[PDB]
């Protein structure tokens, strides 16, 4: 499933930074019960940056196992070297995942033509559906709509997570691609606007802690009841902003811990513990959402 | 040596995309003869992003052996995961490299406190001199002068490659650190200005193909003879700019091949072959510089 | 009328730069026949910058006279000194205009509190409805939603022309103001998106030359037929962009001349004649729109 | 004189918002005694935006008479309409001012060709020396070095006040113009760096309240004694920054009043009184500078 509220799930860790199975199970049970459409495992919010490919794979397999068919799982598979992205993708073939979320190469700043060849080659060497992921603030490059349109012609490139926060992109992309190509927001604070403009859902950080509200908001939005959805969004808006008051996923892991959904808020360096000021900002956002 | 013209050297490759030993030797001899003060091996211009850590270590060791004590070699050791940066740094402990060039974590956007804990841990796991590297347009994050001052108090952290193109940083950093701390431009087009403000040199892309002029420009600059250094800078300014007409190192590798310095201009995806129009652009800038 | 397609009308000039009555009449007849909701007289596209207050007033009175009750007229009245904005506003009291379009002070970069006091004082000393105008790219300041919300409580501040091109502003403002406060796009290329998000119309440069299409697009948008409206918008999109290929109103005045709607494309300095390249770009956009 | 520390002088006002003659005389005496090289009368810091042209001419003439041949006076003559800039310039022909400081048209965003025709026409209607003024954050447009080179060939255009804060412009402009062409910082915080790169001085806001230190800093800089100039710059750096904590000239006028240099800190709307928090911020920076 590539529609509705999709959680960009945290990788819960113990005090030594290793995946905590008991916390992860609890989160998955929570998403099943709360009506989340799918789980992105080991994307950016899941600390893909600081797990090696072995641990990355373990977490995705553990997520599949615990999910036990009750909720679809999409694996993060992005890399800034095309050969590495292919290799990582091969690790998940015939695993049970329903798709992959794959980011524009970060740091090395390829051209549009380079981005096109990068994703075409990934797509060629798998049967798994691919969701492109654009986030220039993190990567230093910007997959423009024209190039998205070229890539949408590839059979198994089926959608895009668009995280510019630039809402003009929704209809620039939409007019260049087929009606079943999926447009997903990657920016929680502008996500309802994104859907109102024609987007089909959101890959969401807020959904980690407000899963039920997020699920209802996205369904109301898909039904065209945008005013009914804005009431919920307005409740969630302090969360949409303050979950990024310190680098993601520091705030959301703290929030998960405060709610009792995970055992510890431990991250891996270069992420560092939440400051006390961040604590009180996030706690106030959780209260505004009605979660504490 | 952490002063004068330091080349951010390309990793020349055969048509298969693997390191070409004869081309690399030719490049190193060229830098020895040209007066280049040091080599950065497998930094960004050397395609650190598309080489695995074993391949990257093989290229550093091969560059060191080929230099044969004639020119100091600095290893690129950057990673966006701290444990991974330590691990890569440790491959070079007691190897003969004189120091490491280590970038701010890219993509995961750490806070200033995160940047501090990252570089500090790295420095504590090595005896090698560490040069910080700040390049916000590639990384999505910006190591501010205040934090550079903090890290400069670590015995082992001895300078910064500053690639913002924002020349105010030279004296903001200088007043916060000791006189022994080295300040290096990471932006060829503004590097002479950077030295005129008190910078000690440049880690240069232009130097790959104009090593003699670059060495002489930096020597004049260190001596305070700025007007004569500008005459060289003006010859070189089209290269400073046009070597980024397409994503680096696509232009510089083609220019190396055109000058007979390397056998092929092959790169790894997501870098792609230079376009015809970029070919003509770089040819004209080489001509302007008097090289072709 | 402050809803639908509102033309930011050109001030047609003869060869000496003086208002051309015959061309202006033709334009007004054209807007009456084409279903334009209203005319903004002597706003930015009408060269408010280069007419003095006497000429400014003459053009607005001439526009009223020629309009002859058939179409409502809104006068541009903005100034970067509060006392000048008041004085200019007093010139139009009891003139027949239905409202004023008043820009954030440009150049002097006041604070939010300053912007609040600026517009409150203007509003206090007239009965005429006021439409706030935010356009940071031109002014160097940005009237934020919070401050719009404070100003909306003033009886006769009735709406805003929002020209950031940042579509998140629509619902940020809307939730802070009453349901009859009017939200108008000031950015043609993102205007349909703006209306789809809840905006009530557009103060438009494209409407100078594609009035009928613009009127229909805005009505379809108000009725919720967004797909039907996008077909028209897609026809107009090259115009929405290329009318700004050179500084507005240079392209649109040329376009008006090519269509025969005005006698000359003359502007006042520092606007200069369209280049030949601009000519062919704009002509191609007019053809794509089906106007030539 | 178009060299050294040139003050962008406030227009001190009584509580009614009109020019206060006793405060202005006190300021001019202060600059004569302090070693300030020249006064810019009714530039931006002098509230050119909120004074009509008659009031602005009255203040320039009063500043000239009070200077009584002891210190050269430069008139601000900027306007975004070319005919208006000419008219204002002509008020000062044969008046005793030594030159004009004239800004790129703000708000109407002319092309580079427009900027060329604007400044050229102005220069042709006067015998007075003209200093160009580029400040893109206020004006919405950017006079590039290439165009500065073009205008410098006009006999009458003799320098530029560069307020981008982008220090690369110093040598981009310098290589395109003759050695007689003057380069002046318009950004106090980067002005010493600007002079170290070959700049000839600064038109300064800081100098309003720290005229002695500024004159001495610029004198040391012209002599090449940069390290000793930095010691002064560091004393002054909190002012360089905090004098813009609220929109200029709100902070500098309050600081003038606190030092007993003017009778009131009154400004014209849309500038508003300094906040309590800004009061405390500016007080601390004055203390740091050793003035209070």
From Swiss-Prot, chains A, B, C, D:
It is found in: Cytoplasm. Pathway: Amino-acid biosynthesis; L-lysine biosynthesis via DAP pathway; (S)-tetrahydrodipicolinate from L-aspartate: step 3/4. Its EC number is 4.3.3.7. It catalyses: L-aspartate 4-semialdehyde + pyruvate = (2S,4S)-4-hydroxy-2,3,4,5-tetrahydrodipicolinate + H2O + H(+). It holds the Pfam family DHDPS. Changing residue 197 to Y/D: 1.4 to 2.5% of wild-type activity. Decrease in affinity for pyruvate, but nearly no change in that for (S)-ASA. Exists as a dimer in solution. Its main location: cytoplasm. The record marks 44, 107 as: Part of a proton relay during catalysis. The active site is at residues 133, 161. It is an enzyme of class 4 (lyase). GO terms for biological process: diaminopimelate biosynthetic process; lysine biosynthetic process via diaminopimelate. GO terms for cellular component: cytosol. Changing residue 44 to S: 8% of wild-type activity. 4-fold decrease in affinity for pyruvate, but nearly no change in that for (S)-ASA. The record marks 49, 80, 84, 106 as: L-lysine inhibitor binding. Pyruvate binds at residues 45, 203. Belongs to the DapA family. Catalyzes the condensation of (S)-aspartate-beta-semialdehyde [(S)-ASA] and pyruvate to 4-hydroxy-tetrahydrodipicolinate (HTPA). Homotetramer; dimer of dimers. This is 4-hydroxy-tetrahydrodipicolinate synthase. It comes from Escherichia coli (strain K12). The lineage of its organism: Bacteria, Pseudomonadati, Pseudomonadota, Gammaproteobacteria, Enterobacterales.
């Amino acid at each position: 499933m590539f529609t509705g509220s999709i959680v960009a799930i945290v990788t819960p860790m113990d005090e030594k930074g290793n995946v905590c199975r008991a916390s992860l199970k609890k989160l998955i049970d929570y998403h099943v019960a709360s009506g989340t459409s799918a789980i992105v495992s080991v994307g950016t919010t899941g600390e893909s940056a600081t797990l090696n490919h072995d641990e990355h794979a373990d977490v995705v397999m553990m997520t599949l196992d615990l999910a036990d068919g009750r909720i679809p799982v999409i694996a993060g598979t992005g890399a800034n070297a095309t050969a590495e992205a292919i290799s990582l993708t091969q690790r998940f073939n015939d695993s049970g995942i329903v798709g992959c979320l794959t980011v524009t190469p970060y740091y090395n700043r390829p051209s549009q033509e380079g981005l096109y060849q990068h994703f075409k080659a990934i797509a060629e060497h798998t049967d798994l559906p691919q969701i492109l992921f654009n986030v220039p603030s993190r990567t230093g490059c910007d997959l423009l709509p024209e190039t998205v349109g070229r890539l949408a012609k590839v059979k198994n490139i089926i959608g895009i997570k668009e995280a510019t926060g630039n809402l003009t992109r929704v209809n620039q992309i939409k007019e260049l691609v087929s009606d079943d190509f999926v447009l997903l927001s990657g920016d929680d604070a502008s996500a309802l606007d994104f859907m109102q403009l024609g987007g089909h859902g959101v890959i969401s950080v807020t959904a980690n802690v407000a899963a039920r509200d997020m699920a209802q908001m996205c369904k109301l939005a898909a039904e065209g009841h945008f005013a009914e959805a804005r009431v919920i969004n307005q409740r969630l808006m302090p969360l949409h902003n303050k979950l990024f008051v310190e680098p993601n996923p520091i705030p959301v892991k703290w929030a998960c811990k405060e709610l009792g959904l995970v055992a510890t808020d431990t991250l891996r360096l270069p992420m560092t513990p939440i400051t006390d000021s961040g604590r009180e900002t996030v706690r106030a956002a959780l209260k505004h959402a009605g979660l504490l």
